[PDB]
Amino acid sequence: MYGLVNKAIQDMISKHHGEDTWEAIKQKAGLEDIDFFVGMEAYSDDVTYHLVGAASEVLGKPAEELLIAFGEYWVTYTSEEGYGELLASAGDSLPEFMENLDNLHARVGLSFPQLRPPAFECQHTSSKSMELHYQSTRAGLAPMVLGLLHGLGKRFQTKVEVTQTAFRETGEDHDIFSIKYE
Amino acid sequence: MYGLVNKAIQDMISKHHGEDTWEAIKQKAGLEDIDFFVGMEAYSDDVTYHLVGAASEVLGKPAEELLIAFGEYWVTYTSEEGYGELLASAGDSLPEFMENLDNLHARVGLSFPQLRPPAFECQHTSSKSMELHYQSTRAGLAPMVLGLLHGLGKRFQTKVEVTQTAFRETGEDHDIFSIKYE
Ligand SMILES: O=C(O)CCCCN(CCc1ccccc1OCc1ccc(-c2ccc(Oc3ccccc3)cc2)cc1)Cc1ccc(C(=O)O)cc1
Ligand SMILES: O=C(O)CCCCN(CCc1ccccc1OCc1ccc(-c2ccc(Oc3ccccc3)cc2)cc1)Cc1ccc(C(=O)O)cc1
Numbered sequence: 001m002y003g004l005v006n007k008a009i010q011d012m013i014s015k016h017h018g019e020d021t022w023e024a025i026k027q028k029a030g031l032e033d034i035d036f037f038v039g040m041e042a043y044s045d046d047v048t049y050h051l052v053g054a055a056s057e058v059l060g061k062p063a064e065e066l067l068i069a070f071g072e073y074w075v076t077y078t079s080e081e082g083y084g085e086l087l088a089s090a091g092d093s094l095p096e097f098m099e100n101l102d103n104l105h106a107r108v109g110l111s112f113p114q115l116r117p118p119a120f121e122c123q124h125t126s127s128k129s130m131e132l133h134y135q136s137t138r139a140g141l142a143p144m145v146l147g148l149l150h151g152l153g154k155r156f157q158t159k160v161e162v163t164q165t166a167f168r169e170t171g172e173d174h175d176i177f178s179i180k181y182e
Numbered sequence: 183m184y185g186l187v188n189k190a191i192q193d194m195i196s197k198h199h200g201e202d203t204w205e206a207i208k209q210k211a212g213l214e215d216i217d218f219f220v221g222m223e224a225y226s227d228d229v230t231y232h233l234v235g236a237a238s239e240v241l242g243k244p245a246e247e248l249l250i251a252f253g254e255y256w257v258t259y260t261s262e263e264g265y266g267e268l269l270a271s272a273g274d275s276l277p278e279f280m281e282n283l284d285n286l287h288a289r290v291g292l293s294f295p296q297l298r299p300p301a302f303e304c305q306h307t308s309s310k311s312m313e314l315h316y317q318s319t320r321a322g323l324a325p326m327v328l329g330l331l332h333g334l335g336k337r338f339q340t341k342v343e344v345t346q347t348a349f350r351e352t353g354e355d356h357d358i359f360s361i362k363y364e
Contacts, residue, residue, distance in 0.1 A: 163325040
């Protein structure tokens with residue numbers, strides 16, 4: 001994933017737990033070698049998994065719980081590290097943001113085109129709910145999509161209730177969520 | 183489940199969608215030979231599952247979305263139909279209520295002893311966070327638990343984010359929810 005992602009992880013860990021524990025996690029992930037992540041440089045995904053795996057053990061916290069907190073962190077982080085305009089442009093509400101999300105990734109994709117953005121389809125079931133289809137080149141990131149959704153809820157002061165109803169991990173085509181909101 | 187569960191589904195659908203829709207759903211579930219549900223009578227679980235499945239078809243919403251809606255409704259419904267005091271006795275906050283739930287079900291299990299209550303274990307990860315282990319003799323009600331949690335937040339006027347972290351239906355031992363609450 002682009003370096004922005006690993007910079008975001010390094011940021012929330014060292015914000016919440018301390019620079020000491022971050023370098024610990026970094027050591028454990030076998031990533032003591034590299035000095036600082038480069039935001040616009042593409043990395044191989046393992047660097048992210050190993051950081052999340054390594055953070056799980058150092059913090060004695062389940063990985064999915066870390067992916068959840070990271071998903072939520074990402075929404076605020078990106079607003080403040082050069083992407084608040086791009087965020088604001090994806091829209092005014094949770095349903096609209098999700099509809100624009102493929103378009104937003106298309107924009108980001110142009111900037112540096114080694115981006116492999118996930119696909120999000122919405123089937124609105126009412127004025128207050130939807131079924132979200134999350135299609136990814138990457139495995140494991142459903143818990144992060146949950147956090148992302150609660151991040152957007154915070155962003156729009158919208159209460160969100162999300163339950164995962166299909167599971168890529170099992171061999172199903174793709175993750176699916178049912179969502180209810182304010 | 184005890185008939186109160188099916189009366190609550192009936193009430194919810196009737197209130198939200200009308201009695202014309204309720205009948206079609208009861209018809210669709212193939213339960214027209216049931217004139218009225220009896221609250222203190224133990225029914226086959228299948229009756230619940232069929233109403234949820236058939237309501238899903240009629241309303242054109244995923245079962246899991248209705249289960250969330252239903253979990254939220256249950257908190258209010260039981261408050262107003264004879265279990266207000268029982269509910270009150272289980273505490274003045276979300277962490278307390280959840281901690282008392284195993285005892286709330288003990289007292290429900292003298293009225294009547296054929297209750298199959300789920301077990302809820304809380305690991306409090308801070309004063310604003312819990313890991314909730316939900317263990318059930320039933321399948322597929324995790325989304326209802328999610329709704330129940332949001333119902334309690336409403337009840338105690340507390341902001342609450344629930345994220346499921348482990349899923350019984352994929353073959354994990356029991357559902358696990360991560361919960362932040364203000
Ligand atoms: O399943 C997957 O493959 C990844 C899932 C989680 C990742 N994000 C989640 C999307 C999301 C969902 C809800 C709410 C907000 C979301 O994202 C907002 C966002 C995401 C990415 C960027 C971004 C910005 C610059 C990037 O890199 C650049 C930019 C300019 C020039 C060079 C590189 C890369 C991503 C900005 C805002 C977005 C994302 C992040 C990284 C990549 C990637 O490296 O392929 C692809 C997508
Ligand atoms: O996993 C499962 O197997 C079921 C998940 C969802 C069900 N509820 C969840 C409990 C709950 C969770 C969060 C917040 C509040 C909750 O419950 C409040 C409550 C629950 C049940 C009753 C209740 C009252 C009367 C009952 O039945 C009677 C009453 C009098 C005489 C004879 C039967 C049964 C349940 C009242 C308040 C409660 C429940 C309802 C029915 C049964 C059962 O039929 O076995 C078991 C439990």
